[PDB]
């Protein structure tokens, strides 16, 4: 039972960190679009 | 002589009114460039 409680905690804790690495890869891909949006903001002010 | 001078000043008004419309359609051309950049930012916001 003590191995099963330990194994259950490791499964929870690998899924909490597989998610955590997923959320940062998604944040790194999303910031690239906002950089290109902000380039069009600066390019608009050059057109203005 | 007064009639020919009236037609000269009339032409000078028409020159100013032409240059107002010429500067205004240069302004709208630059304002369509600015809107084309706004639309590209709205497309990048969509694919975001």
Find out whether B30 and A45 touch, Cβ atoms under 8 Å.
no
- Quote the CA–CA distance of B42 and A7 in Å, as a whole number: 48
Nominal resolution in Å? 2.8
3-state helix/strand/coil string of chain A: CHHHHHHHHHHHHHHHHHHHHHHHHHHHHHHHHHHHHHHHHHHHHHHC
- Quote the CA–CA distance of B48 and B46 in Å, as a whole number: 5
Report the gap between the CA of A14 and the closest CA in chain B (Å).
29
Count of C-beta atoms within a 10 Å radius of residue B37: 19
- Quote the CA–CA distance of B25 and B4 in Å, as a whole number: 32
Contacts 24+ apart (CB under 8 A), B22-29: none
- Give chain B's contact residues with A (Cβ, < 8 Å): 30, 33-34, 37-38, 40-41, 44-45, 47-48
- Measured between beta carbons, the chain B residues lying within 8 angstroms of A41 are 41
């Amino acid at each position: 039972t003590q191995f099963g409680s330990t194994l259950q905690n490791i499964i929870e804790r690998q899924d909490a960190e597989a998610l955590n690495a997923l959320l940062q890869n998604q944040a790194a891909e999303l910031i690239l679009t906002n950089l290109s949006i902000q380039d069009k903001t600066i390019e608009e002010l050059d057109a203005e | 002589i007064s009639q020919s001078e009236t037609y000269r000043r009339r032409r000078q008004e028409w020159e100013i009114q032409r240059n107002n419309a010429e500067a205004e359609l240069k302004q709208i051309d630059a304002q369509l460039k600015s809107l084309a950049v706004r639309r590209e930012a709205a497309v990048l916001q969509k694919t975001s």
